[PDB]
């Protein structure tokens, strides 16, 4: 996605723990259960990653709410899944099939500029059709 600082350099650096589990001495003190957190929608708030989630789900790809996504992580701590991590590290792709959209940066930015540009050409036209009705019918008759 880009323009995120060292966010992707610190999440990718955390993926050495699956190989450092074997090569080091902390196997019986720590168990690794890394989880790929998917496209989680926010709190229903005003976000650019919330407005395009509807058009992103038209491709057959699931986006998650924060209560569905928490149920996925809470299912990684069931006592049969805590036992799986003691035999070796466990990677859980909780990403909802979003890894099959290849042009994902350019497709999502196409969905932002689709939603934003019709927000302008409908607002400015509603403004200019409003102004045009007040020069023809006069400013005297706007009291309703």
């Amino acid at each position: 996605f880009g323009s995120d600082g060292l966010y992707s350099e610190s999440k990718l650096g955390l993926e050495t723990l699956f190989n450092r589990w074997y090569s080091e001495s902390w196997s019986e003190q720590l168990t690794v259960c890394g989880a790929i957190i998917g496209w989680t929608r926010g709190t229903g708030l005003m976000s650019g990653n919330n407005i395009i989630a509807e058009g992103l789900e038209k491709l057959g790809v699931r986006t998650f709410s924060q209560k569905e996504m928490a149920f996925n992580i809470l299912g990684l701590m069931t006592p049969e899944l805590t036992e799986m991590c003691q035999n070796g590290p466990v990677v859980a792709d909780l990403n909802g099939g979003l890894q099959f959209i290849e042009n994902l940066r350019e497709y999502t930015a196409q969905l932002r500029n689709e939603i934003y540009e019709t927000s302008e050409v409908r607002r400015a036209v509603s403004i200019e059709t409003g102004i045009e009705t007040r020069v023809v019918n006069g400013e005297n008759a706007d009291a309703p």
């Binding site: 540009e117 302008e120 050409v121 400015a124 036209v125 200019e128 059709t129 102004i131 045009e132 020069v135 023809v136 019918n137 006069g138 400013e139 005297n140």
Partner: protein, 769 residues
Amino acid sequence: ANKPISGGEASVSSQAIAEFTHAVGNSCEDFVPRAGRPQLAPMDFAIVLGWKAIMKAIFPKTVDGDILKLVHLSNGYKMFPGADPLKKGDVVSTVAHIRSVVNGETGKTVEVVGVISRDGKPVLEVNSQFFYRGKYQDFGNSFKKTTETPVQVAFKSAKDIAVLKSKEWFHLEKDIDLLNQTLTFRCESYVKFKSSTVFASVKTTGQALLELPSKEIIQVAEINYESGSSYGNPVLDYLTRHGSTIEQPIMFENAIPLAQGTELTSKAPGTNETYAAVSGDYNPIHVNKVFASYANLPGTITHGMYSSAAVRALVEQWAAQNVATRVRAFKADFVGMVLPNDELVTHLEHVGMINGRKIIKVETKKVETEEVVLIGEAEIEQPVSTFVFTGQGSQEQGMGMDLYNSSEVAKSVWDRADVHFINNYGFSILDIVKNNPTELTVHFGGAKGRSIRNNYISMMFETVAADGQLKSEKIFKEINEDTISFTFKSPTGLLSATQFTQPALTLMEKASFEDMKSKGLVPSESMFAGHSLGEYSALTSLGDVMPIESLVDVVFYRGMTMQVAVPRDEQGRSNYGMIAVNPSRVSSTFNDSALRFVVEHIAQQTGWLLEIVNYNVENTQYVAAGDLRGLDTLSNVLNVFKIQKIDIVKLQETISLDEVKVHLSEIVDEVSKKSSSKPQPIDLERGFACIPLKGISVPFHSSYLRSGVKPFQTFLCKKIPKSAVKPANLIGKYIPNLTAKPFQLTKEYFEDVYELTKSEKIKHILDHW
């Protein structure tokens, strides 16, 4: 009142002119019948000729009111472009029509426009403005038709096109992307009135058009808004708050007073009976005291059109220098009346410019009660002008950069061509001008750098060898598909290189001209020429045949073919050069023919291609170019008979036998031998007449590179297309360097183009109708 009003056929006579100019005091030379030249008539004679048409407009039953309350508010004249004034034996016809019969809180205002037509073609129009006083409620007859101002609207976003397309009055004819482009609206209205603040039937019907980048305008749309019983104009309200008006007058930040140190007093006459006889305005509120007292006036007041015609003679005296053709339009508002025999002073001043014409503002007041009587302004043409454009050899590091930072229209031409230079050629021409470097490396790194390299491999030129023909080779032979960088080197700055000084000089002289033209400082009919490089800068600005992006293309290419046309040696030098000869610094009897014979003598004896390539000043400046050891004899033949001092034989006449072809033969031959003894990197040897032109290693404007014009012709034919040429911007005004006659389309002007070029492109049109 909507049909036009014919005013009949009227003539001009010498008895009508001379009685007119005496009645107003117009003692200009053009209106008095001298011997030799035809007599002219003033613009004020149009209200005499168009009196029967204009005054018939207030008369219909639909435009109602009494003439005894009628006020003449204003009256203006305007001459159509390209029109001569009225002659002595001129016969004219006039057509008038009414524009607006609007009502107000006081009575109604009638606007009448009448044009004068000489032999079918219109010469000038006159628009008046009358005012029936009273209280009127006839709104069924009230109308107003206009031609609205040329608003230009730009569309720099995709919502601006959608706002425009949502309007039902916008009929988009030719579907085209209007993003980052500008439309111009020529709209005209026709309004009926209902109660002086609401309308009855609005009809705005205009057009819209776009300038496409091959110097071409096309209609892209059509405005059609036919409403009724509305309150205002939404078409005009859209163009007001979105676009800006163009073709408007440009006012100075400080006006300048015109007749300084002179009081311009124009005291009203004793009677109004003489002006009423010379104009036909026989209404008795100016001559009869009974009618002037019945119509509630202070007295038998002076004609309003007298006051215009008498103050026009002061503009014709002080703004124009008593020449009538320079007065193109004059309007005046009759605010407050004058009685006969009262003193009044004017105040001429120059407040702005439009289309190269000067806007002189006048203001006439009475000297005693100090109330303003006449407010008007004129449209005095400038003196006849020529814009010459400088060639190469004069270039400074930082030229035009003070104008670049101050003017916004001189910045948008330097910027528009620098974007073209970076994206297509890999350097900045603003970087060259602001600090000329010794080196400049163009890099071909990325995907957009390998496309820049494709522009260097795809430019070709031609030359001849010792024997053979044209070759059609690459200019940059050292640029190929494995080349990652190319460097330009010049040991005396990069403004000294010809391929960088030519697109930097034509850009500055276009930036300089475009700043003047945006201020309204350039006349309509003005000649132009350029010396050696400026004739490309002349017709990109006054000719308007190529845009700024293709101008710098054909002139970077021009200085490139004028660089590889000479076979340079192991260094950057060669055997060809240039010298500047002065036939009166030395050898005080020489003329243009006494030195053209000498350079032809070394052109025939020992050959070597020595000729003169520009005749700048007669007997003062000739710059001749040739090869070294041929050009070195010229600076050591004419430069040696000021020391041993034989004056040449044509001091009075040649002797009756022909020794002049053979007595100066051995002196040019005894210097021809010692030129061969000099080393072939031949030095300059200025002498006393010749100035040693340094940096010019190519014989410009000779016939040595006659062979190279064939790739340069086919390059020009694809950057100056046929539709881009406007003939009226060149005919009779452009003066080339090839044929020093002005540009004309005549069958014997084409002869001199053939006997200088021998081109088959004009040969196969020379033999037709």
